[PDB]
Design a protein around this ligand. Structure first.
Ligand SMILES: O=P(O)(O)C(O)(Cn1ccnc1)P(=O)(O)O
Ligand SMILES: O=P(O)(O)C(O)(Cn1ccnc1)P(=O)(O)O
Ligand SMILES: [Mg+2]
Ligand SMILES: [Mg+2]
Ligand SMILES: [Mg+2]
Ligand SMILES: [Mg+2]
Ligand SMILES: [Mg+2]
Ligand SMILES: [Mg+2]
Ligand SMILES: [Mg+2]
Ligand SMILES: [Mg+2]
Lengths: 724, 716
């Protein structure tokens, strides 16, 4: 049976990632290189172990609560998704820590971009296969065990658990899975981002501007902290976040299809004429899973060809060819799959398939194209090759104040072009296949999460390799090879963040729909969807909730930035004290103390990482129990809008600042060099952008999805338990 | 009849402002007055050019309105535009004339009292001008078109040629508010761009690069800084706040006018609708009278203990008097009406008074939060300042974090206020509270303008070698003033949010046609946010607000970069300027800033005007409503954040300058980082922040005016 092969696909992805990891094992690693690799891996492993222990304790608590109030299988799937996210993060962290020194040694010996690009892509591919395989494995496991083995997909009827809980079985199970994935991603990424960005700000600022020392200089006591933070915050958090986004895209369609069946009914003399055939509903539920499986398989084939493919001097050319080929093949195979799976079905027109069975494929096509433009728009704004980043670089001569003001404008201006792309994508998907197609586009925009995760992971390995080169005092040319891979990596990371936020926006609209559906009760089960899908924004409660949600998102970003700044200030103080008190460090005859900086950042991150996830979880609950369901819908809408805007702005502005600093550093500016005051302004801009790109930017989509899932899960009790 | 007295009230405000201007126009002269004349000439030239451009564009817009809509709409448009322009220019002239007088008084007396009196008199002239002009234009329109012409008597939805369904007096007041808003937007954009660009360039080049004192005469941009303060923070302030006051009034006026035809067999007696339409005008008149009484008591009384103390005492007394008189007015005027429950008056005739009180208290809480977040007397600004020791990047990051965090308390206050206001009086309450939050705009205008005058005094003190105590007193007053500016911006954004909700209501009402006149109001008040078009429009509106802020910042930064380059070149090439024995070329800096401002002032207003038309003609009315919601949210957030963060940076820089940090003084590297933070916040404080509420209201007004045509005339 081919269903067995498609379900085994994710295990094949995991096996291929393991094979690539083995291929990267036994590669040539110097004794100092091996020592630095062991140090970085030990630091990252310790931090990740502490973070994972805390996160899984909290996850056990959350799972017990979910099992109590909601279906026990809901908590079981929550644990499944949480373990999936944690495993993806740990795998990525280990792969990066192992491959940084391998890529550095390759770049040092061959002196050619080919081998280093090959090794770094092997690491990124291992991580991407881990992400995709874990996501799809957990999702298909939930599907089979709870819907197929337990038959939760067969019932598809609204139940009432004790305490007055109105739920759908498979809906609750998949929602719990997505919620676990999102919680684990939130905790991991928050911790890693705080750590890495604080270390980066302190180290880069103190070394570049105050000590006049090179970047990632071994003399700098914060270099190890910066490298380990890159390994943890931008490598493990990256995988967690992207796996969570993939699972959310799939799960939005899953819940929408599940709710579609029992809701589309007609009351007739108190006889409830069911309006949609169950077979069609099951086909629509399985469609997104099979589509994600096809995307994962196509990404696997593309990555295999790339690893076997001819190496190119420019890594960007190979990355672009790989993603283009994988996307085209996925689109074609998905067209065929969508036609065959939904061919000659019944009820599609009723659920919004105006064109027909192929209408979800048209919506998925809209998602892929919309994402491509969002990435392109990000590239123009964040790349020095394009005009805007160059103007920011030219702004260096005028001063730090001009650089900061110019960067802020580029980010605020940057939001409009992608947002128009998203607005057009949403409208066309609704025209092509209603809300189900909205969710299908959310999924399609991230259909090939494996390749994007692979490239984004490929970046950090090159960064950590570059840091190893300066500390180990390797030849300047080898460092130059590492820098070339990192310059493309920064822009590709911004593109990935844009993809994530777009898929999150689509899935969040579909989750608004699912929430409005969840607001229904058995006595009100016969309402027409027109009355169910109504959220009047003239209701004072709805608009008040929208305002409160936007404000909550803004304060959340502010608190993240505050954590990063506190850590970075502590680090700057420690670096100044070490430089003043320790003799011989600036001359190179003394070895500073990095453990103090590592401890400062680790403690601050582990202490401050918990509160934001708790906020994101409890805000919907408290707001709903206080002001009802309409206020919660308004809060969700405001959060979605504010999060999209702020994520786009922060990612683009941080990338622009960093790329302008690299532009000046590369020597493309006329007359001004590393020690110039304009370079100090670029360093200040890059430090300001460090938290914005990898701390505030990525967390916003996770917050949106987690909040929407919490609301859809808990709306049943808070409609009648509203205090006011 | 007392109606005559209430209509004369605005003339009383104008007469009292003129009397104050004449009394303080004594303008005591000092050592060469020449520099004051120079600054006044520059400011007047810039304002004249700006006004010429704005009035050309206004004539074009008025012709278009008269053609497509009722000519009375364009006439009221011109009336409101002229009112706002007169307020702005009057305030700018008064400040430019009284800055040197107050500075000389403060120098001679060596005491804060006399300078406080003169500066508060200037602010009072400005605030009385704003309030009196608003109420004069409003009562004139009311009387001429609704009372004498009987537009209040008709109260029926009409359909003029081309298929526009409108209400007469509603359209007239909409045109009035739209004209005021266009003029305010243009004036504030120009003045803010000019002033903030000059300030950024001067501070960076002098303090960080040249190591020169603030407002040093050797610096060729100091004159530019003072004149820009006069243009952006003296005229723009009045334009923007007068526009906010007029918008608060007109929102309630329009909602009430649409209700009588929409509610249907008429559910609400016409007398009740006319009474509710006339109520907000009399309420604003009473508020203006109370503000005048408070300003009179303050100006006649002896000097206050603290400059903040006098402003707060005046505001408290005015608010209490307004509350009492408004209670009496609301009871007497609406006591014997009927059908007040149908429109939303849960408690009865006193519901609008409760909603206005809720709005006033929400504004007071917003001010409390602003004072908490933007004053160095409290914890957050102190932490931001201490962040300077950790570098400039740390200062910037902490400032951004503080700004983003400050948005929460005010937003929660606004949520509670919206909820409570709806409970007492419905959406009419949301609008009456929008007005109540700004019931005493005169005193707020006075206090807000008082800051810039003290700033100009400090700049002039540095320009002409003067005793240190003079500039110390002026800087003290200016330190108090910046927080007052932030509190005023908070008041403005809150009133804008309330009026924007009421405008959503009026917009949904306007979407009705004569053939669809019988629909139940419950079905009319629906704007489904699950409609893909509505949410897409919300996203696009948020993006439009963000790109608008980005364009403002880009214009300001380009102008400031050109200015910084010119100042650096002047300092490097001219010998003896840094040695203190020379004098540079200020005219070049002034010309650069003025040219850039005049070139960049047009695009943002055109965006704010055309966004609704294009979005509606492209996607329909639901998309336009979504764009309105997205714009409202994004603008509220961005305005609050920018204002609060800029105020925090500036107050932390003053904290370090005052010597409150241990061991680190003026000219220190941490002080350089603090100056960089304040300069980065400069455009955010007075250019991007205030423009957002004007953008929201202008966009909502344009949409409400043209919703009828695009509701069914949509290309897609
Ligand atoms: O991870 P980050 O963005 O901090 C950094 O990697 C940015 N970067 C450097 C070159 N390309 C991007 P670095 O710490 O090397 O300054
Ligand atoms: O233009 P602003 O109001 O920010 C300013 O007046 C701020 N300030 C100065 C003293 N007290 C407040 P200056 O540019 O003179 O630094
Ligand atoms: Mg860096
Ligand atoms: Mg790095
Ligand atoms: Mg580094
Ligand atoms: Mg960086
Ligand atoms: Mg300043
Ligand atoms: Mg000034
Ligand atoms: Mg000044
Ligand atoms: Mg300033």
């Amino acid at each position: 049976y081919v269903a067995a092969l498609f379900f085994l696909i994710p295990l094949v992805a995991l096996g291929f990632a393991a094979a690539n990891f083995a291929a990267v094992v036994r590669k040539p690693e110097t004794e100092r290189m091996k020592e630095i690799s062991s140090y970085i891996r030990s630091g990252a492993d310790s931090f990740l172990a502490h973070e994972t222990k805390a996160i899984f304790k909290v996850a056990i608590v959350i799972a017990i609560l979910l099992m109590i109030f909601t279906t026990w299988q809901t908590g079981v799937a929550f644990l499944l998704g949480a373990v999936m996210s944690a495993s993806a993060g740990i795998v990525g962290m280990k792969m990066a820590t192992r491959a940084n020194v391998r890529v550095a040694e390759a770049a040092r010996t061959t002196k050619k971009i080919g081998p280093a690009l090959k090794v770094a892509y092997q690491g990124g591919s291992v991580m991407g296969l881990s992400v995709g395989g874990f996501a799809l494995l957990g999702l298909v496991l939930v599907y089979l065990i709870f819907g197929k083995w337990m038959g939760q997909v067969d019932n598809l009827n609204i139940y009432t658990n004790w305490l007055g809980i109105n739920f759908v079985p498979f809906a609750m199970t998949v929602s719990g899975y997505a919620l676990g994935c999102s919680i684990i991603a939130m905790f991991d990424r928050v911790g890693g981002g705080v750590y890495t960005k604080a270390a980066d700000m302190a180290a880069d600022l103190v070394g570049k501007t105050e000590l006049n020392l090179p970047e990632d200089d071994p003399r700098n006591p914060a270099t190890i902290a910066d490298n380990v933070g890159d390994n943890v915050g931008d490598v493990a958090g990256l995988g967690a976040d992207l796996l969570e986004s993939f699972v959310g895209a799939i799960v939005s369609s899953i819940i929408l299809a599940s709710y579609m069946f029992p809701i589309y009914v007609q009351k007739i003399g108190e006889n409830l004429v069911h309006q949609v055939p169950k077979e069609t509903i099951q086909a629509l539920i399985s469609y997104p899973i099979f589509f994600a499986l096809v995307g994962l398989g196509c990404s696997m084939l593309g990555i295999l060809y790339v690893i076997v493919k001819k190496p190119s001097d420019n890594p960007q050319r190979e990355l672009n060819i790989s993603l283009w080929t994988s996307a085209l093949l996925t689109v074609v195979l998905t067209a065929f799959l969508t036609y065959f799976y939904l061919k000659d079905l019944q009820g599609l027109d009723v659920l919004g398939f105006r064109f027909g069975a192929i209408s979800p494929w048209f919506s998925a096509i809209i998602g892929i194209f919309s994402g491509i433009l969002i990435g392109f728009w990000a590239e123009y704004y964040t790349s020095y090759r394009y005009k805007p980043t160059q103007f920011l670089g030219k702004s260096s001569i005028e001063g730090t104040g001009m650089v900061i003001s110019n960067g802020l404008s580029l980010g605020m201006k940057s939001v409009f072009p992608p947002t128009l792309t998203l607005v057009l994508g949403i409208l066309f998907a609704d025209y092509f296949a209603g809300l189900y197609g909205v969710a299908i586009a959310a999924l399609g925009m991230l259909s090939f999460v494996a390749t994007s995760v692979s490239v984004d992971s490929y970046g950090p390995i090159a960064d950590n390799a570059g840091g190893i080169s300066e500390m180990c005092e390797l030849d300047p040319e080898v460092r130059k090879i590492t820098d070339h891979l990192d310059a493309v990596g920064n822009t590709t990371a911004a593109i990935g963040k844009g993809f994530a936020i777009g898929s999150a926006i689509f899935a969040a609209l579909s989750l608004f729909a699912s929430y409005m559906f969840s607001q229904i009760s058995p006595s009100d089960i016969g309402k027409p969807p027109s009355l169910v899908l109504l959220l009047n924004m003239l209701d004072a409660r709805v608009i008040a909730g929208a305002l409160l949600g936007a404000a909550i998102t803004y304060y959340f970003s502010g608190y993240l930035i505050s954590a990063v700044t506190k850590a970075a200030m502590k680090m700057v103080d420690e670096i100044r004290r070490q430089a003043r008190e320790i003799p011989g460090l600036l001359e190179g005859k003394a070895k500073p103390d990095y453990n103090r900086c590592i401890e400062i950042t680790s403690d601050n991150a582990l202490k401050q990482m918990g509160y934001p996830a708790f906020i994101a979880i409890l805000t919907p609950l408290v707001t709903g129990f206080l002001l009802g369901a309409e206020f919660v819908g308004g809060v969700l809408i405001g959060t979605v809008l504010s999060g999209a805007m702020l994520a786009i702005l922060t990612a683009n502005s941080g990338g622009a600042w960093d790329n302008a600093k690299k532009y000046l550093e590369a020597g493309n500016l006329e007359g001004y060099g590393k020690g110039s005051e304009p370079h100090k302004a670029l360093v200040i801009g890059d430090t300001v952008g460090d938290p914005l790109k990898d701390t505030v930017g990525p967390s916003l989509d996770i917050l949106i999805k987690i909040m929407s899932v919490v609301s859809v899960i808990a709306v049943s009790i808070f409609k009648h338990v509203h205090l006011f």
